[PDB]
């Protein structure tokens, strides 16, 4: 056992990916093009509430059976989502796939959003959002997207406060009817035979064809949102419009990322292979952190750096992170740096798929925003095929582009976007 | 059959809650199921039930009833809760059955 | 397609071969381009004494700051530049250093590992720097109630013994430990017969062991050197420690009885038992419909922010209990229901409950082998604790033999009418009296 | 004051200079009504350039004088009126601080119409910076300003405030005839210039409500 990865594409545009790795456990998932991106000032947060609504009664199964049912076979059911993609997946031992499938099917294609259930659920948005925001890390990213854009992506990933309790069963239904359409959905599935996963997608996935609501283009604003809140630590993120998914310039940034440094590889260790880290290190004396920030969205992307530092030293720390970006845009990139990075990137990519979750994600992401599976050797071929110039250019694009900044903490000594 | 379908209309008038301007469902003893159902009623239905009931209590204390014109007519009686209540009970029976299994 | 039963059988076997110096080499070869290899050492704070407590942790901090063959800067640059991830940890009875890299580099990795455990530089200047760092990590960890509570749980449950100590050590030990003590610790504990080189991913057992013989040399002369030392047993004590700070927002409470220790089979039943009670946290969407009774009550009565059951094992002993986080005014009811559920375990478990508990347990064990690092962790641990690998196929066999009747007998055997160990931290005024708790240990 | 006050001498802590940023803070909160304010560095207190703005203020329109009435003498109001159809409000915003000041307009309008309403308020500002100011408008304003000033002192509170404000940021009492002399002594050009300073300067904007149709500072 060890071979293939079939991938049909039914009549209505519903893509079905599949790979049998003979694992004792399966993991099926419904990827969908949907998220706070398609929200309008009128229905903000509805995507978030929908995320928390996965366990509510459906036309085929009740709130009670959904949970007891899945749990009876040691299974699990969860919903992960970004500003533009929502994944509903379930895990369980091979022998229970058929059982767990019923609920996955029901949740994504037959919700009832009964008013009362929905009313009792809403206060959960307050809770859910409260734990997430315990990481300053999350607050600035929300504000970043709100400063980097004027629409679509500018929309927060967590239901704004004023709207908690105001979302309606209508909005949920309408959001689902206009986005969870066969042409926007993919039924991926590790640990199963393609014929089986396909026979399912057919006789049962009802909500047929369509493309429904189309997200407005991602306009770029380039704003600066600051948040004075006292924290001894200041989190700052400065970016610029970057590459989009499957963009040619993408691979370039991803590499400039590792060159600048994106995450430590040695526990409690210093990062020498990180120009950005190393640069800041020579600038400040106290504890801190700095990384290359890089997001690639359907019709846009963000690139820059993210820094955490003691308040009084945010000034020196941010400047440093900048000088290190300019210094790179001016040919401050060795042919070797480009070599090292390329490896760290290939390695990171390859390790990030040992996880049942990691693999399903990789597979399904393609099968949704493509319909094909770029072989690993191909993705490799595409990565190293990035010149030392491409990298220096990416860096240039940053130093020149219009920047947007998001920071939070005791910003008393934190510089403004126009002072960098 | 349309036999007791008459008997009902008879009983309905014998009962007499319609003289208080109450719907059949307004007269239900609020046990657990009924209590849950009531929480599910839409705002408007709920407030209408409330006024009807308060109105009846006021008539009851006064020892009066509504003028014959205002009595609810058998065929115009709204079974506004029966739908919710039927659901609440199935859910319960589902859980009960499942918890034995 | 293929059944769960079969997929279990078709799992590549774990190869183990012992060298001549006593070191054991094991691995599970997969078809993966990326891999994980590292050494799992049977050492930790339990092996420390009152004066070197924290050394193994201090050694964890230097383990990566360079060896003698290649100083700090070089070592890091060499690992970073090959896209390899270097990580590790140290607990009460087990330490580890492992690397995540491409199978291609498997041999160079093994050389790096062996260089780390055998040749730590222990640079005098570095030590003074990690000294301040560790002192900082102490103040940070001091604000993690969950760990402050488990430390206290050990501190009292195993009071007056080695297991009573924390892994990081004391403020004193850290302010004074010497280059010598750290050297001594390494030279005293990191030894072949007590180590295991485990690897998982796309790797040839043979290529592994070959690269092993090459870098793991140090062959012992005396009989003392290759004899694995038996630790003095740690006495358990039913008792409590209450650290009260009404200024803290929520309280943490942990209760536990003495567990059997790695070797014992009952641990399979205990884990099944823990699955019945399970766990919870305010973000479990299942809410009031969760199968776990304690979870349901927690939801229905807003009993706590979260709770977890655990069966922490050690060589000759362990801790079987639960920990919850609740608001000052719901501690009492939470504890009440919790102990209540334990009594249900001993007296009225249902086949339905165990049936479900088993499936949850199966998924859990499988989920523990989701990746190379986790498979490697399992191998290193199993060898060091069971002296061999236990395949999921075996685990499943054992797990499937458990039934209601068995859960009740095992639980009664470890829980019923036992004096527990209690640790409470925070605004705990409403939780109270060991006596009252002790009574919650009997009569369903 | 003497034989009693004790905490004394010096000027202690000195405030840092007022640096100008020119940012744009938006607040999505759902409100059916959107409040927006667009300004630029205005004039300081005691500054000669003050009077000019104060007047451009009345010319553009700052507050109604007739209950439930329309403001014709308000170019800004009138301008926006021709632009939107639904209820709204718009005024000349003007603040004068020790070492700086702010000037612009403030607008309240239904969400969907904030776009048209803010644009309007702008066009009406540019139109004024391009000599769109009659010698009469300057005359009317000057009166409304002198009147407003004079009425704003009938109040025990109003009077004490006026008096005290000078005695603190000066140490003297500019006679009413003098303040009058200073006000009308403002050319029609001064006014058109003030307006220019706005259209050219770097603007900062602050809005809150259902900003779904509210424009960004860079779209004006």
Encode chain C in three state secondary structure.
Answer: CCCHHHHHHCCCCCEEEECCCCCEEEEEECCCCEEEEEEEECCCHHHCCCCCCCHHHHHHHHCCCCECCCCHHHHHHHHHCCCCEEEEEECCCCEEEEEEEEHHHHHHHHHHHHHHHHHECCCHHHHHHHHHHHHHHHHHHCCCHHHHHHHHHHHHHCCCCHHHCCCCCCHHHHHHCCHHHHHHHHHHHCCHHHEEEEEEECCCHHHHHHHHHHHCCCCCCCCCCCCCCCCCCCCCCCEEEEEECCCCCCEEEEEEEECCCCCCCHHHHHHHHHHHHCEEECCCCCHHHCCCHHHHHHHHCCCCCEEEEEEEECCCCEEEEEEEEECHHHHHHHHHHHHHHHHHHHHCCCHHHHHHHHHHHHHHHHHCCCCHHHHHHHHHHHHHHHCCCCCHHHHHHHHHCCCHHHHHHHHHHHCCCCCCEEEEEECCCCCCCHHHHHHCCCCC
Using alpha carbons, list the distances in angstroms from residue A344 to A245, A337, C100. 20, 11, 11
Q: State how far the Cα of C196 lies from the Cα of C96, in Å rounded to an integer.
A: 10
Nearest CA in chain C to A259: C81
Method: X-ray
Instruction: State in Å, rounded, how far the first CA of chain C is from the last one.
Output: 45
Q: How many domains does one find in chain B? A: 1
Active site residue C394: no
Domain A1-208 has CATH 3.30.830.10: yes
Alpha-carbon distance C417 to nearest alpha carbon in chain A (angstroms):
31
Sheet containing strand A86-93, strands side by side: A7-9, A15-17, A185-190, A25-32, A86-93, A76-81
- Asked whether the beta carbons of residue A71 and residue C61 sit closer than 8 angstroms, the reply is no
Count CB-CB contacts under 10 A for residue B86: 11
What are A76's strand-pairing partners?
Answer: A91
CB C73 within 8 A of CB C12: no
What are D63's strand-pairing partners?
Answer: none
Using alpha carbons, list the distances in angstroms from residue C51 to A369, C45, C48, C162, C164. 60, 11, 8, 12, 14
Q: How many domains does one find in chain C? A: 2
- Asked whether the beta carbons of residue A22 and residue C76 sit closer than 8 angstroms, the reply is no
Residues C171 and C52 in one domain: yes
Phi-psi region of C163 (alpha: psi -120 to 50; beta: other; left: phi over 0): alpha
Alpha carbon C166 to its chain's center? 13
The verdict on A160 touching D (C-beta cutoff 8 Å) is yes
Count CB-CB contacts under 10 A for residue D22: 15
Q: What is the 3-state secondary structure (H, E, C) of D58-123?
A: HHHCCCCCCCCCCCCCCHHHHHHHHHCCCCEEEEEEEEEECCEEEEEEEEEEEHHHHHHHHHHHHH
The verdict on A244 touching C (C-beta cutoff 8 Å) is no
Active-site residue identified among C60, C130, C168, C258: C60
Alpha-carbon distance A41 to nearest alpha carbon in chain B (angstroms):
26
- Asked whether the beta carbons of residue A269 and residue C76 sit closer than 8 angstroms, the reply is yes
A–C interface: beta-carbon pairs under 8 A: 151
Q: State how far the Cα of C198 lies from the Cα of C96, in Å rounded to an integer.
A: 10
- Asked whether the beta carbons of residue D23 and residue A221 sit closer than 8 angstroms, the reply is no
Nearest CA in chain B to A68: B98
Picking from A62, A68, A115, the nearest residue to B91 by CB comes out as A62
Closest to A260 (Cα-Cα) out of A140, A394, A419: A394
Last residue of a domain, one of C195, C227, C259: C227
Query: A226 burial class (0-12, 13-18, 19+ CB within 10 angstroms)?
Result: buried
Q: State how far the Cα of C333 lies from the Cα of C344, in Å rounded to an integer.
A: 16
Q: State how far the Cα of A190 lies from the Cα of A29, in Å rounded to an integer.
A: 9
- Asked whether the beta carbons of residue C7 and residue A24 sit closer than 8 angstroms, the reply is yes
Contacts of residue D23 in chain A, CB cutoff 8 Å? 224
Q: Is D in contact with B (3 or more beta carbon pairs below 8 Å)?
A: no
Nearest CA in chain D to A151: D212
User: Helix H segments across A212-329?
Assistant: 248-260, 275-283, 314-329
Does residue C7 lie within any of the structural domains?
no
- Asked whether the beta carbons of residue A40 and residue D212 sit closer than 8 angstroms, the reply is yes
Residues of A147-185 as b/e, b for ≥16 C-beta within 10 angstroms? bbbbbbbbbbbbbbeebbeebebebbeebbebbbbbebb
Alpha-carbon distance A131 to nearest alpha carbon in chain B (angstroms):
30
Residues C175 and C53 in one domain: yes
Alpha carbon A272 to its chain's center? 28
Residue A370 dihedral angles phi and psi, to the nearest 5°: -170, -80
Picking from B39, B94, B95, the nearest residue to A116 by CB comes out as B39
Closest to A70 (Cα-Cα) out of C291, B101, C306, C292: C291
- The residues, ordered by sequence, that sit 6+ positions from C250 with a Cβ below 8 Å of its Cβ are C145, C305, C325, C326, C327, C328, C426, C427
Pairing of strands C15-18, C24-29: antiparallel
CB A315 within 8 A of CB A331: no
Count CB-CB contacts under 10 A for residue C400: 10
Using alpha carbons, list the distances in angstroms from residue C45 to B50, C141, C161. 68, 17, 11
Sheet containing strand C251-258, strands side by side: C239-244, C421-426, C251-258, C318-326, C306-313, C279-281
Alpha-carbon distance C233 to nearest alpha carbon in chain A (angstroms):
33
Residue whose token pair is 């790096």: C112
Q: State how far the Cα of C216 lies from the Cα of C192, in Å rounded to an integer.
A: 8
Q: State how far the Cα of B39 lies from the Cα of D32, in Å rounded to an integer.
A: 30
- Asked whether the beta carbons of residue A64 and residue B94 sit closer than 8 angstroms, the reply is yes
Alpha-carbon distance B22 to nearest alpha carbon in chain A (angstroms):
25
Using alpha carbons, list the distances in angstroms from residue A87 to A17, A63, C425, D26. 14, 20, 39, 32
Interfacial A residues in 273-332 facing D (CB < 8 Å)? none
Does residue C1 lie within any of the structural domains?
no
Alpha carbon B80 to its chain's center? 7
CB C152 within 8 A of CB C234: no
Count CB-CB contacts under 10 A for residue D140: 14
- The residues, ordered by sequence, that sit 6+ positions from A187 with a Cβ below 8 Å of its Cβ are A14, A15, A16, A17, A28, A29, A30, A197, A200, A201, A205
C-alpha angle B30-B31-B37 in degrees, rounded to nearest 5: 70
Which residue range(s) make up the domain with B83? 1-101
Q: State how far the Cα of D213 lies from the Cα of C443, in Å rounded to an integer.
A: 67
Picking from A42, A150, A160, the nearest residue to D216 by CB comes out as A150
Alpha-carbon distance B98 to nearest alpha carbon in chain A (angstroms):
9
- For C30, the token pair is 């997969």
Residues C59 and C189 in one domain: yes
Q: State how far the Cα of A259 lies from the Cα of A274, in Å rounded to an integer.
A: 6
Using alpha carbons, list the distances in angstroms from residue A384 to A336, A388, A395, D198. 12, 10, 17, 53
The verdict on A375 touching C (C-beta cutoff 8 Å) is no
Contacts of residue D216 in chain A, CB cutoff 8 Å? 150, 221
Residues shown for chain D: 220
Using alpha carbons, list the distances in angstroms from residue B75 to B11, B18, B71, B78, C398. 13, 11, 12, 8, 66
CB D53 within 8 A of CB D42: yes
Picking from D25, D212, D218, the nearest residue to A41 by CB comes out as D212
Phi-psi region of C166 (alpha: psi -120 to 50; beta: other; left: phi over 0): beta
A–D interface: beta-carbon pairs under 8 A: 20
Closest to A3 (Cα-Cα) out of A22, A29, A24, A25: A22
Q: Give the distance between the most distant pair of CA atoms in chain D.
A: 63
Using alpha carbons, list the distances in angstroms from residue A300 to A45, A249, A257, A363, C253. 22, 11, 17, 22, 48
Count CB-CB contacts under 10 A for residue A79: 19
Which CATH class for the A220-420 domain?
alpha beta
- For D91, the token pair is 């005024």
Neighbours of chain D (3+ CB pairs under 8 A): A
Contacts of residue C123 in chain A, CB cutoff 8 Å? none
Neighbours of chain B (3+ CB pairs under 8 A): A
Query: C170 burial class (0-12, 13-18, 19+ CB within 10 angstroms)?
Result: middle
The residue ranges of DSSP E strands in A219-371, in sequence order, are 224-228, 233-241, 288-297, 300-310
Using alpha carbons, list the distances in angstroms from residue A280 to A290, C6, C43. 8, 54, 37
The single-letter DSSP state of residue A149 is B
- For C329, the token pair is 């005014």
Give start-end residues of each CATH 3.30.830.10 domain in chain A.
1-208, 220-420
What are C288's strand-pairing partners?
Answer: none
The verdict on A349 touching D (C-beta cutoff 8 Å) is no
Alpha-carbon distance C138 to nearest alpha carbon in chain A (angstroms):
15
Sheet containing strand D100-110, strands side by side: D24-28, D203-209, D33-41, D100-110, D88-97
- For A131, the token pair is 């734990």
Q: State how far the Cα of A129 lies from the Cα of A362, in Å rounded to an integer.
A: 27
What are A408's strand-pairing partners?
Answer: A227, A235
Closest to C60 (Cα-Cα) out of C70, C48, C69, C51: C48
Which residue range(s) make up the domain with C291? 239-442
The verdict on A130 touching C (C-beta cutoff 8 Å) is no
Q: State how far the Cα of D36 lies from the Cα of D88, in Å rounded to an integer.
A: 12
Residue C325 dihedral angles phi and psi, to the nearest 5°: -125, 125
Picking from A162, A221, A223, the nearest residue to D29 by CB comes out as A162
Does residue C5 lie within any of the structural domains?
no
- The residues, ordered by sequence, that sit 6+ positions from D1 with a Cβ below 8 Å of its Cβ are none
Residue C440 dihedral angles phi and psi, to the nearest 5°: -75, 0
CB C54 within 8 A of CB C177: yes
Q: State how far the Cα of C216 lies from the Cα of C111, in Å rounded to an integer.
A: 9
Sheet containing strand A224-228, strands side by side: A224-228, A404-409, A233-241, A300-310, A288-297
Interfacial D residues in 9-28 facing A (CB < 8 Å)? 21, 23-25, 28
Neighbours of chain A (3+ CB pairs under 8 A): B, C, D
C-alpha angle A134-A135-A137 in degrees, rounded to nearest 5: 150
| Topology given in CATH for the domain delimited by D20-220 | Cytochrome Bc1 Complex; Chain A, domain 1 (3.30.830)
- Which uninterrupted H or E stretch holds A77? strand A76-81
CB A224 within 8 A of CB A239: no
Count CB-CB contacts under 10 A for residue A121: 18
Contacts of residue B42 in chain A, CB cutoff 8 Å? 115
Alpha carbon C240 to its chain's center? 23
Last residue of a domain, one of C227, C249, C271: C227
Picking from B39, B42, B94, the nearest residue to A62 by CB comes out as B94
Q: State how far the Cα of A40 lies from the Cα of C245, in Å rounded to an integer.
A: 46
CATH of the domain at B34: 1.10.1090.10
Query: B36 burial class (0-12, 13-18, 19+ CB within 10 angstroms)?
Result: middle
Picking from D28, D216, D218, the nearest residue to A41 by CB comes out as D28
Using alpha carbons, list the distances in angstroms from residue B40 to A43, C323, D118. 24, 37, 45
CB C315 within 8 A of CB C93: yes
């Amino acid at each position: 056992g060890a071979e293939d990865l079939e991938i049909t594409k039914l009549p209505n545009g519903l893509i079905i990916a599949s790979l049998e790795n003979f694992s004792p456990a399966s993991r099926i998932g419904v990827f969908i093009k949907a998220g706070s991106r398609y929200e309008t000032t009128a229905n903000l947060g509805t995507a978030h509430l929908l995320r928390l609504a996965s366990p509510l009664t459906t036309k085929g199964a009740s709130s009670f059976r959904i949970t007891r049912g899945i749990e009876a076979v040691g299974g699990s059911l969860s919903v992960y989502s970004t500003r533009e993609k929502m994944t509903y997946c379930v895990e369980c031992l091979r022998d229970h796939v058929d059982t767990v499938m019923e609920y996955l099917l029901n949740v994504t294609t037959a919700p009832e959003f009964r008013p009362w259930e929905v009313t009792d659920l809403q206060p959960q948005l307050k809770v859910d959002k409260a734990v997430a925001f315990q990481s300053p890390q999350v607050g600035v990213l929300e504000n970043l997207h709100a400063a980097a854009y004027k629409t679509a992506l500018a929309n927060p990933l967590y239901c704004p406060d004023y709207r908690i309790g105001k979302i309606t069963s209508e909005q949920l239904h309408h959001f689902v009817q206009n986005n969870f359409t066969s042409a926007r959905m993919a039924l991926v599935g590790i640990g199963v035979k393609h014929s089986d996963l396909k026979q399912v997608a057919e006789q049962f996935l009802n909500i047929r064809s369509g493309a429904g609501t189309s997200s407005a283009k991602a306009t770029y604003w380039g704003g600066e949102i600051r948040e004075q809140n006292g924290h001894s630590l200041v989190h700052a993120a400065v970016v610029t419009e970057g590459a989009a998914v499957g963009s040619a310039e993408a691979n370039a940034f991803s590499v400039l990322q590792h060159v600048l440094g994106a995450g430590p590889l040695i526990k409690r260790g210093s990062s020498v292979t990180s120009k950005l880290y190393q640069g800041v290190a020579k600038a400040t004396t106290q504890p801190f952190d700095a990384s290359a920030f890089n997001v690639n969205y359907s019709d846009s992307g963000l690139f820059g750096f993210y820094t955490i530092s003691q308040a009084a030293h945010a000034g020196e720390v941010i400047r440093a992170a900048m000088n290190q970006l300019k210094a790179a845009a001016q040919g401050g990139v060795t042919e070797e740096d480009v070599t090292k990075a390329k490896n760290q990137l290939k390695a990171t990519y390859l390790m990030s798929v040992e996880t049942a979750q990691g693999l399903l994600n990789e597979i399904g992401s393609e099968a949704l925003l493509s319909g094909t599976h770029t072989a690993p050797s191909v993705v490799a071929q595409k990565i190293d095929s990035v010149t030392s110039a491409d990298v220096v250019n990416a860096a240039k694009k940053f130093v020149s582009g219009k920047k947007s900044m998001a920071a939070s903490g005791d910003l008393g000594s934190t510089p403004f976007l126009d002072e960098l | 059959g349309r036999l007791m379908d008459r008997i009902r209309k008879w009983y309905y008038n014998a009962a007499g809650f319609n003289k208080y301007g109450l719907m059949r469902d307004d007269t239900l003893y609020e046990d657990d199921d009924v209590k849950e159902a009531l929480k599910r009623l839409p705002e408007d239905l709920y407030n209408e039930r409330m006024f009807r009931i308060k109105r009846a209590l006021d008539l009851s204390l006064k020892h009066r009833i509504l003028p014959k014109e205002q009595w609810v007519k058998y065929e115009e009686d709204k079974p506004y809760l029966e739908p919710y209540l039927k659901e609440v009970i199935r859910e319960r029976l589902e859980r009960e059955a499942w918890n034995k299994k | 397609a293929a059944t769960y039963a079969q997929t279990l059988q078709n799992i590549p076997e774990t190869n183990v071969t012992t060298l001549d110096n006593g070191l054991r080499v094991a691995s599970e070869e997969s078809s993966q381009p990326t891999c994980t290899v590292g050494v799992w050492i049977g050492a930790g704070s339990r092996y420390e004494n009152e004066k070197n407590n924290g050394a193994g942790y201090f050694v964890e901090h230097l383990a990566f700051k360079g060896t003698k063959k290649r100083p700090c800067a070089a070592f890091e640059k060499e690992v970073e530049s090959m896209g390899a991830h270097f990580n590790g940890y140290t607990s009460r009875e087990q330490t580890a250093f492992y690397i995540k890299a491409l199978s291609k580099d498997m041999p160079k990795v093994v050389e790096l590992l062996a260089d780390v455990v055998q040749n730590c530089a222990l640079e005098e200047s570095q030590i003074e720097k990690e000294r301040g760092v560790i002192l900082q990590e102490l103040k940070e960890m001091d604000n993690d109630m969950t760990n402050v509570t488990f430390d206290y749980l050990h501190a009292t449950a195993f009071q007056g013994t080695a297991l009573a100590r924390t892994v990081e050590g004391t403020t004193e030990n850290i302010k004074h430990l010497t280059r010598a003590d750290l050297a001594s610790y390494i030279d005293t504990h990191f030894k072949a017969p007590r180590m295991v080189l485990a690897a998982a991913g796309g790797i040839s057992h043979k290529e592994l062991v070959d690269a092993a013989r090459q870098h793991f040399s140090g062959v012992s002369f005396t009989y003392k050197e290759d004899a694995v030392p038996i630790l003095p047993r740690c006495r358990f004590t039913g008792s409590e420690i209450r650290a009260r700070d009404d200024a803290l927002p929520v309280a943490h409470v942990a209760l536990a009885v003495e567990g059997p220790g790695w070797a014992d089979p009952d641990n399979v039943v205990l884990h099944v038992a823990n699955a019945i009670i399970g766990r919870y946290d305010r973000t479990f969407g299942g809410g009031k419909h969760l199968s776990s009774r304690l979870a349901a009550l927690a939801v229905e009565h807003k009993l706590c922010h979260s709770f977890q059951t655990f069966n922490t094992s050690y060589s000759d002993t362990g801790l079987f209990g639960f920990h919850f986080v609740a608001d000052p005014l719901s501690i009492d009811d939470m504890m009440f229901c919790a102990q209540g559920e334990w009594m249900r375990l001993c007296t009225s478990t249902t086949e339905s409950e165990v049936k479900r508990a088993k499936n949850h347990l199966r998924s859990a064990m499988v989920a523990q082998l989701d990746g190379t690092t986790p498979v490697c962790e399992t191998i290193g641990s199993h060898l060091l604790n069971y002296g061999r690998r236990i395949s999921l196929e075996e685990w499943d066999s054992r797990i499937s033999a458990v039934d209601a009747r068995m859960v009740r007998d095992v639980c009664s055997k470890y829980i019923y009418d036992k004096c527990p160990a209690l640790a409470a931290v925070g605004p705990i005024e409403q939780l109270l009296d060991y006596n009252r708790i002790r009574s919650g240990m009997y009569w369903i």
